[PDB]
Design a binder for this molecule. Sequence first.
Ligand SMILES: Nc1nc2c(ncn2[C@@H]2O[C@H](COP(=O)(O)OP(=O)(O)OP(=O)(O)O)[C@@H](O)[C@H]2O)c(=O)[nH]1
Ligand SMILES: Nc1nc2c(ncn2[C@@H]2O[C@H](COP(=O)(O)OP(=O)(O)OP(=O)(O)O)[C@@H](O)[C@H]2O)c(=O)[nH]1
Lengths: 1196, 498, 21, 16
Amino acid sequence: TKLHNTIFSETRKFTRESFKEIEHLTARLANDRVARHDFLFNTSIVLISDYSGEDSNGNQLQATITIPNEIINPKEYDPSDYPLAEDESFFKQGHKYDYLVTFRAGSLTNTYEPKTKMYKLHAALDKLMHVKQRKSRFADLWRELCAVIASLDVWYQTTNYPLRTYVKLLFHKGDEFPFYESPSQDRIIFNDKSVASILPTFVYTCCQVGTAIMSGILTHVESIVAMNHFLHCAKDSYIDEKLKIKGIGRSWYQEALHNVCQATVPVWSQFNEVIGHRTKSTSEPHFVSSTFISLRAKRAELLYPEFNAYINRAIQLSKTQNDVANYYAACRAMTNDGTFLATLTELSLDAAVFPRIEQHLVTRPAVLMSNTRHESLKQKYTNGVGSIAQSYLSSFTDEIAKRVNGRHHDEAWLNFLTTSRIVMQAVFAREYRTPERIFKSLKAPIKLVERQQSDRRQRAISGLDNDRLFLSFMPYTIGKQIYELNDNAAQGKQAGNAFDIGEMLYWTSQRNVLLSSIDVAGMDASVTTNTKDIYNTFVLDVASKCTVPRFGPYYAKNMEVFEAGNRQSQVRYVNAAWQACALEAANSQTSTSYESEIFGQVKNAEGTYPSGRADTSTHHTVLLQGLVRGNELKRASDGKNSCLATIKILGDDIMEIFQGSESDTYDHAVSNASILNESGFATTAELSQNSIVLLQQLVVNGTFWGFADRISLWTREDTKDIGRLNLAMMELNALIDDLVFRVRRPEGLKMLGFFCGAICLRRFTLSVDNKLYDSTYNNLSKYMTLTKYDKNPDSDSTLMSLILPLAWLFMPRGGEYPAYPFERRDGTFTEDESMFTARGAYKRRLLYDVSNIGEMIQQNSMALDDDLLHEYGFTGALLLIDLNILDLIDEVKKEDISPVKVSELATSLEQLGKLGEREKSRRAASDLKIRGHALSNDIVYGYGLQEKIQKSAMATKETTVQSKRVSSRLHDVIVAKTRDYKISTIPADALHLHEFEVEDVTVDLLPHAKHTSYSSLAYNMSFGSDGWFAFALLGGLDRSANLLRLDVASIRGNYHKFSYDDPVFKQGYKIYKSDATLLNDFFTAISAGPKEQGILLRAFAYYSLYGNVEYHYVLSPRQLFFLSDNPVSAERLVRIPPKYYVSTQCRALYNIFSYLHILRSIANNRGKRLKMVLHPGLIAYVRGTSQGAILPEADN
Amino acid sequence: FAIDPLKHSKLYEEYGLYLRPHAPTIRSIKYASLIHSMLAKHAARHNGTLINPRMYADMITLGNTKVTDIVTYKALTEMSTLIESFRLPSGLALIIFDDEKYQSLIPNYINQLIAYTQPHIIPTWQGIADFSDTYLRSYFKRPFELTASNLAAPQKYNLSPMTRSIFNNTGREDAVIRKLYGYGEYVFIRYEGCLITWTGIYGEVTMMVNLSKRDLGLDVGDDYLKEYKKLLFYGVITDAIPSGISARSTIMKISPHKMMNPSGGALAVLSKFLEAVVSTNVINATLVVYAEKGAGKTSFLSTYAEQLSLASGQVVGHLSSDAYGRWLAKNKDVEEPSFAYDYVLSLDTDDNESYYEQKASELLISHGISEVAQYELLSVRKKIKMMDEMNEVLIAQLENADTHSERNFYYMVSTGKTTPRTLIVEGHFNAQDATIARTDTTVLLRTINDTTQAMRDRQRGGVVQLFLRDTYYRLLPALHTTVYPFEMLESIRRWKWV
Amino acid sequence: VQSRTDVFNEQFANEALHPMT
Amino acid sequence: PTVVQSRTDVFNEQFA
Ligand SMILES: Nc1nc2c(ncn2[C@@H]2O[C@H](COP(=O)(O)OP(=O)(O)OP(=O)(O)O)[C@@H](O)[C@H]2O)c(=O)[nH]1
Ligand SMILES: Nc1nc2c(ncn2[C@@H]2O[C@H](COP(=O)(O)OP(=O)(O)OP(=O)(O)O)[C@@H](O)[C@H]2O)c(=O)[nH]1
């Protein structure tokens, strides 16, 4: 004791003595809940009334800790906060509070008699504060608070910082915690009833603030201004004030960056490369400057006067453009605590899914032809937004009807019913050939599906129905055909690199550009019944040309028809497509129905249909490009010029880029604004010269401003938390990687992610049998430390807890995380690893590196050092991994790496599309199962989308305590492995022996090290930082490589690098080695493109001869964002002594050695060139195997 | 045929199709009745499904296939010998009527064969199949129309009871004709409905009614207003709208005719509202009905709430389409209006003046339109320019939620204490979907009227009525299910209560 | 005297195809 | 020298 006095705290290295100390102090916090109370709330802490220091840019700031009385002494629960209607059929129309209100946690009690109106209500509000407030990603909400504060102790080497006083002033009541969460009951259980009801969400808010200090956004002085705003924002309702302020508070950067005037920024080309830098003036146009007056008057009224005085400070004291970036990162973390927003779904139902009328009323088209029911068949607009929208979309009708004829729609629908056989044709013949089918789907209600999201209200999305989706299936099929005929929308696969934003880094660098970005997220309410009729005129004009003989239950037949100008019914030949599209438009019931435990069944108003599914994402995609591009044709008809360059319809955004004179670009950008008004949408574009705004990204002058408040480490939407360590530790590597370029100090995310896995993810519990219990504890204690529990006579098994050896976080096949320097026997330390280190099989080098390698090359020994690794606890950590006790991870869960994509329009269309491929790969897997070779479900192509459809549709409890049973079998394995155990080396580890000696020659930097030195490309890379200098050495990123992997990801759906351990290979080689004629049936089952069939069929011939030789590593695309993906980029940074060209012909392998060592050492790299030093046993291993066996992916 | 004519004949009796007595085409109706029996036995044998339907489709329809373990092919070989014994030179074409009630009665074992076959589709003109078709000519009798001039003994014309089936259009009771002129051998085709032809402003117009000709009290020469309310409930006009039907229309002709079938799409949405009326889970149950202005909806729906109250037993309220317009014309000034249901229902009488008719009357005089004759001379671009100026005064009420706003009015009436549980609300245009609420069922109601000829005739409102119709028409596509007045009465009859 | 054209439903249909410049 | 200082010095000399 204590953490801030530890040897690790001062040297930030792992010696033999300082690793055990930090391994002990985290074992005491992860276990005892007495030691955690005494860690956070300890009396030695001296409170801070007033504090002084520097803000994000270095200017000095003075703040004061002020906690309001209304949080400390809450009001008693007032039933008028959540009023009902007179008939008590729903919450009152106007009502202020959609979320918790701040009241004394004991003031809420239901004394009413059961099964009354008010009893059900107070049962739900009691369920609101006790249940909905529980969201935690890793461990108990208190263990997530220690991990944040424990890292701040170690980082700053003090216990005195302002964030720790809030923790003591708020959550310290008596000698126990005010509240705690019980996983059995899935609730928060209040000890002190006098505590405020909203504090359970301030445990998560102190975590997201404490994450912002370690992240390097906020300082300790800005931590006060941030936490005083949150405490201010909670009265009466905490989340209701954030949502009201959130826009006001973040929009000042436009004005602050106007006063900066000139700024020098990089210049990008089309091709994702930096071609130079440029000095531009950031002064905004007059029509932008006029909006700064209305915002000053608004920010003054609404904002907390201490936080408003911080914004007024960032507009003045900002000097260059980087200074504006550093304040906008802080002002964004002051308005957002990162938690997912939750209510009772019938409190938030009003303001979300309830339709609204805005601007102008849309009007009907003239009906040129109609059904005998007077249902419209073909129709046309007189003038208005309709005619503008059609003057564009009507040019695609005869191109689409060609493509809608080529499809087979009955076979298209079987592929939907099957992938989400002769059995299924009896179903389709019974269900869908009857006219009664149309009747069943009109009578069916529409359920209300909601999905939570951070810093925004709960969002209503539409799930997949069998009956309701069948009415709109035919318009969807016709509608999605435009995606191939246009550039106007991004449905493509997302790379995750800067390749994704690479097209808006080009236009922010261009000259004479006006940049419009509209937020369309709230549109689906603004759509009315008459607004959808702009899309129907597009579909009914395509369906009149399309001829499909049958789409059940519709036939092509001569139908009586009325026309305009003819007084009697005509007769036309009306095909089954334009019977099916005409009935979908004429019968429209939009309104969803949610069934509430309080009010029974609640039904929404008729207007608004949510945007979730692929079918109504095309409705919103086609309608917008129809209005915005069709307006461009209307201008040329008026004699006016058209300056619009491009349009991208993203999921929640519309991004227009105009280029021209300031007079033209404004007059055109205004008329596109009035045409979305005349169509009934109330929206305001953000017009900006040098900045363009989207979700989770901000691109300003060819740079990138990442939003780090949208990656929530400490909370989840699912609350699927279980005892699964492998899936959890993999989920943490996905988040930490996702913050690397959104954060100003990645060296702080490594210490914060270490105390998460040290405290939160540490302990693991298994259930031994009664007879084997004392035999297990005796064998494992030689390596792992354990805690025994009393034996219960009422059961046949006993629980016992296992706290992991701390080195398990760093081990290759277990959890794997960037290491701190360990200490060799020599006294020298291994290199401190960066966030750029490559996971996977590359992590086994840490064993040979601590061994060390430099002594192994000289002594010509391949023998690992068993004595040290046992002292740091690597042996017990590798033994734990060998036993396979921890929970397995599917290949399907791996398919979600959890980068958050830029456009969600492709997330929608991915659900219902590409059916013929997911069917053909379904035929293959079954027909192959019959032949005697069965494939695991995770490998088959369409199975990833099938599980997420069915599994989310179950309400069965997923909450079960995770306890693994040690039976006679596994206990038999424990005794074996734990006796003689010494770490197991494989022959392929000879590739892990190589060393780099630092030479005296400095290396030429790339010419774009200069262009990126003025205004930085991202928060983590600024001039001199670790992300900049690595970008100066290895220039990113390879365009023709990222185009190649997105052509492969366009079949399999996702890209994963080849490996001989990949379960796709393993089972593929079983077929190859036994029955070769089934490979064609195997390659369709997994839908490998013609390129991957070559990579496999070669590796089968290498794996037959040589076994498993490859040198494997994992670098995520989100991890390396601007940096290069191609190892050849390091060819110039290392010299190879010429005597290795004679013996070994593998040059491209020495580049992967050089590439991974340079990314790993960049924190320590001063710019000198290296020299490769190879082990004699490495050379002799490489020249007994062809290089193609080591690098099967690459083409030599 | 899809539905076996020999077993189900009462189904074909409706369309006017009676079976011949029992001849190379007559033996073919017995063969197809043996093929249906052989299928339904094989179908019910395995879970109600045919095991290899592509064989049955060709064996039956094309007749080109012969077949020769115990589950698989033992059923096909039983079918192969049955069809081989028929010795037909060609198969039997699978026949289906265009009718919607017909297609929904087809057995499931024929639906499995339809995907493999090219079914001959017989068009139905009024809903009665055309007797000029080939397959309806040989298998069924061919009707003969007796009229006033046509009527004589069966011996005059060539007629045999085994060929022609008499259709009595003469208006004299079938007992007379059968007994007096010697038709006692012939079988009369009986129609329970009526078909009328009215004179009209633009020409001749036809109307179908679900009332028998003795129930409906009308003959040739009788006026449109006589027996109006019977026609309003049960009538449908088969001519393109606008039809010329006005109050001075007279009957040119009457004939008995097949009763119409209520659309299964309307009875599906109407029975979605009757599941809310019954269910104890739902608190408030509202039905939103849209109609063109001048279609006679409040005359109908007021008597729909009577039939819905008597069958259910619950109390049913009715808000007329003008309930909000007339309420606001009073309470627009009062800063705390009374939303009590029985109060709104009092202002809802026809003698009150709506608010929108006051704002629209000022809008007309400002353009100088004092008379219906003047509004007819205006150009279309000129009318729509005036109507866009009503759309600006219509948004004012819907655009927000206030004490006087339209969203609030229907909110305080529907959520009141003393307001009935179930309501019926009438909207003018689709933009009120977000205002009059909150429902999973909303329909659009068509009647027998020319709504532009009704607002032209009434001498009270005059222009202001005709101008508001066209304004609302312009805002009201048919985007919701179309329901006729007799389909809402048939929807209650088919629903089973308690 | 009146025509099947003066009706609004119709005037509107035609307004739609010889739109009146 | 701190690493940043060395990095800055290296950068300046090449680009003088
Ligand atoms: N009496 C009392 N029990 C508590 C309190 N807070 C939590 N507990 C329960 O006491 C149990 C034992 O505490 P710990 O050994 O620290 O358990 P834990 O840290 O919650 O981790 P788990 O054992 O996995 O639940 C926990 O499972 C809690 O459910 C408290 O304030 N008072
Ligand atoms: N001249 C005149 N005709 C009326 C009057 N009241 C009803 N009618 C006629 O009766 C028909 C039915 O009127 P209503 O029952 O009020 O239904 P409506 O036509 O939709 O009228 P609203 O309910 O006001 O929309 C109309 O088409 C008129 O032709 C009236 O007071 N004066």
